[PDB]
């Protein structure tokens, strides 16, 4: 009984491995060795935003690339303007433990959550010039890690109990639930057309999911430790992942195979966040060594380093227009780089 | 150069800036503590005695305000959410010495916590419960110690000699882990308590005073 099923699973795994080996033609580095290098890139700080009294755990850019939000552990949520560096809104919180924040694409609601196991949705466009709690969503056994918006009336939530959920604000009940993870999940990434989304967990695996059907199309596994951040290619055909083993990896969908590793023998600390740029030549990644690095997306060579913080970096972001990037750390300061 | 609209915006920004600075002082006063331990231990009993989803408790001693936090869940896989508690003054670790079969798990847990990478500055207060039950079980005579720990028979002692010898054996067993690689950055406090004690708050107060004194004296560089 069980032995026959195990033998069938082993045969399926061997067939998949043989197909993957057969599909491999040539290395990517040899193909891309013809392209000329971009060369040395240097950037300098333009503005520093201040006004927090604790560490920072989240950040998200606006759609117009002029406004942003920030969340901290002092119990405050702050809305900031970029050019003039003025403050628009400050919101107190019921719970003092917060790990993520989310900004809407329309520009009318914000989302927060953390160790309290409830995701809170706030409405900004009201009368009497006040911000009130619009809704509270409960029904998760563990803490929350990430959450994004699909539209004005949908939300996707990821928690620490090896599950994910899809919520509708008006109804208030989980219309769909995604399960199949052995270990707690950390990050979550969403496709440009909002038809598919990808997630990663602590079991050194990544899984692809379809919103309409709610079934796991594909699974990937090539790491050795926890996965801390995930990004998505501009085209919609690749992933870049960062883990606790100090190595970054690039994965592909159609070929179902890894392409390249990003590593160096002189760095040992873990990776905390990754991102791309508009064209796709650059890969930005922050580390625990008090600084951030930029890598070539094709030649896999070190290009530039960014320094200026006194603690580890926690989040970073790039605008839609691609004019500038933003970074934050445990120094209670935010820095805008051009 | 700048219109009236920008002037009004800047004025609003300044009035927003004032309140955060004013409010920070009210929160910067109280003290914070974490509570950790296993099941079958008197966390709720001691919490109720001191007083008279995350759960929190607040109390007042000598015009000094204490908050106590504890988290329950994750099936003893806490490697992720411990990183949040990187600024608390102290962690209170409580264990039962009555049961002789589960002590190895207690030693393993203490060794795991003491050697964490992020928790290289936080100090721990060690509480041992069920002293009277231990004394009764010793006086019964049907419970043996040399079976679980062979060294206990060869140990030499530095109401009954047996109970005191067992107590000091347990205390040495727990303390000896901490002093291996302490490096002088953080220390341990061993205490003995029962289920009907009432003077725990004074011990907590004195230990917090000592911790703050050591930190401050290290800051001013008098050593």
């Amino acid at each position: 009984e069980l032995d026959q099923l195990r033998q069938e699973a082993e045969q399926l795994k061997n067939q998949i491995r043989d197909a993957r080996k057969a599909c491999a033609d040539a290395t990517l580095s040899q193909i891309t060795n013809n392209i000329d290098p971009v060369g040395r890139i240097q950037m300098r700080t333009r503005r520093t935003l201040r006004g927090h009294l604790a560490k920072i755990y989240a950040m998200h850019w606006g759609t117009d690339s002029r406004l942003l939000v920030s969340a901290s552990q002092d119990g405050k949520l702050i809305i900031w303007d970029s050019y003039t560096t003025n403050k628009v809104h400050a919101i107190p919180l019921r719970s003092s433990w917060v790990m993520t924040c989310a900004y809407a694409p329309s520009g009318n609601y914000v989302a927060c959550g953390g160790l309290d196991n409830i995701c809170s949705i706030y409405n900004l466009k009201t009368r009497e010039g006040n911000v009130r709690v619009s809704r509270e969503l409960a029904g998760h056994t563990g803490y929350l890690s990430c959450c994004r918006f699909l539209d004005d009336n949908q939300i996707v939530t990821s928690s620490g109990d090896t599950t994910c959920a899809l919520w509708d604000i008006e109804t208030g009940q989980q219309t769909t639930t995604f399960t199949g993870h052995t270990g707690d999940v950390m990050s979550l990434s969403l496709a440009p057309d909002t038809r598919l989304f990808v997630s990663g967990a602590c079991d050194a695996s990544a899984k692809l999911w379809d919103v309409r059907e709610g079934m796991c199309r594909q699974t990937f596994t090539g790491h050795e430790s926890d996965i801390n951040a995930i990004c998505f290619f501009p085209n919609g055909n690749a992933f870049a992942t960062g883990s606790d083993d100090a190595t970054c990896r690039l994965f592909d969908l159609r070929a179902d195979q890894e392409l390249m590793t990003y590593s160096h023998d002189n760095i040992i600390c873990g990776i905390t966040s990754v991102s791309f740029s508009k064209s796709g030549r650059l890969l930005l990644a922050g580390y625990d060594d008090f600084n951030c690095n930029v890598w070539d997306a094709l030649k896999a060579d070190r290009a530039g380093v960014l320094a200026g913080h006194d603690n580890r970096v926690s989040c970073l972001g790039v605008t839609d227009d691609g004019m500038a990037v933003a970074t934050g750390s445990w120094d209670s300061f935010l820095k805008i780089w051009n | 150069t700048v219109s009236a609209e920008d002037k009004a915006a800047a004025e609003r920004s300044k009035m927003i800036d004032k309140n955060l600075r004013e409010d920070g002082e009210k929160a910067r006063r109280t003290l914070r503590l974490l509570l950790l331990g296993a099941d079958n231990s008197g966390k709720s009993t001691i919490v109720k005695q001191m007083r008279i989803g995350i759960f929190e408790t607040k109390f007042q001693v000598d015009k000094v305000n204490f908050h106590m936090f504890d988290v329950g869940g994750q099936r003893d896989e806490r490697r992720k959410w411990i990183q949040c508690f990187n600024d608390v003054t102290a962690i209170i670790f409580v264990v039962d010495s009555s049961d002789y079969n589960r002590l190895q798990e207690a030693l393993n847990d203490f060794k795991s916590i003491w050697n964490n990478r992020w928790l290289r500055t936080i100090s721990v207060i060690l509480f041992l419960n069920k002293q009277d039950l231990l004394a009764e079980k010793v006086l019964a005579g049907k419970s043996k110690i040399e079976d679980y720990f062979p060294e206990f028979a060869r140990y030499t002692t530095p109401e009954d000699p047996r109970v005191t010898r067992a107590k000091y054996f347990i205390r040495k067993e727990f303390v000896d882990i901490s002093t291996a690689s302490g490096d002088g950055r953080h220390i341990c406090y061993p205490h003995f308590t029962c289920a009907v004690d009432t003077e725990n708050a004074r011990r907590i107060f004195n230990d917090c005073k000592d911790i703050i004194l050591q930190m401050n004296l290290r800051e001013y560089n008098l050593v």
Partner: single-chain antibody, 222 residues
Framework: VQLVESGGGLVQPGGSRKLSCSAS????????MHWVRQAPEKGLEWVAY????????YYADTVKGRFTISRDDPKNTLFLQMTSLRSEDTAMYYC??????????????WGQGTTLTVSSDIVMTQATSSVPSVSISCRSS???????????LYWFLQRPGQSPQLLIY???NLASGVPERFSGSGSGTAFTLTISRLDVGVYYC?????????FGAGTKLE
């Protein structure tokens, strides 16, 4: 949201009187307040302005040194004291509220008025005294455009027997509750309001670039 004003009375010239107003249904410390008066047989003219937190006070040039404005936040009241009453100081009085930040819509609400009987700057230009798809033109002595990319002009509608409202700010943004038929356009020293699928009243041009605020002459659709 209620702004109720009830005070004052007819007194002899050389006397004094006090005006008061109360607000209910919204936060009071957040906004800034304006006092504006209208003569029985003339247009609108700005009188005084007070900011949030009483940081700044602004008085009109022609009535400086004879009026005083203040407010009490716990009591949610806004009052003024009048001195050296004259014959020409007979006009109805209105109070309005505003809020200033990125993307705000000031001059949102207008309250009811009380009738009082007594016993250089930019000059606007209207198309005509009255005009029975409708387009209305407006002109200014100086271009109302700044380097930061914003241009300042508001369109006010007055209805017979009702308080004025707000329609268009920055000639590209529709106020809440405004049907989509209204529209506005223009450039340096040339402003245009367009309405299709015809609502009659008087429409006012307003300038907010500099502190002394000047209203429009007044054009009526019949």
């Amino acid at each position: 949201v209620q702004l109720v004003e009830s005070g004052g009375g007819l007194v002899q010239p050389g006397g004094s009187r006090k005006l008061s107003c109360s607000a209910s249904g919204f936060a009071f410390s957040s906004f800034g307040m304006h006092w504006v008066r209208q003569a029985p047989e003339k247009g609108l003219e700005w009188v005084a302005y007070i900011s949030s937190g009483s940081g700044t006070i602004y008085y009109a040039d022609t009535v400086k040194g004879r009026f005083t404005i203040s407010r009490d936040d716990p009591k949610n009241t806004l009052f003024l004291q009048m001195t050296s009453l004259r014959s020409e100081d007979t006009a109805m009085y209105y109070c309005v509220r505003s809020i200033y930040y990125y993307g705000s819509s000031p001059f949102d609400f207008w309250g009811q008025g009380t009738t009082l009987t007594v016993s250089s700057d930019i000059v606007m230009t209207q198309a005509t005294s009255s005009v029975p798809s409708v387009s209305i033109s407006c002109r200014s002595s100086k271009s109302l455009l700044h380097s930061n990319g914003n241009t300042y002009l508001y369109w006010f509608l007055q209805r017979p027997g009702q308080s004025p409202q707000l329609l268009i700010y920055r000639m590209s943004n529709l106020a809440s509750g405004v049907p989509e038929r209204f529209s506005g356009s223009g450039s340096g020293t040339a402003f245009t309001l367009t309405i299709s699928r015809l609502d009659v009243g008087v429409y006012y041009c307003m300038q907010h670039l500099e502190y002394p605020l000047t209203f429009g002459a007044g054009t009526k659709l019949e």
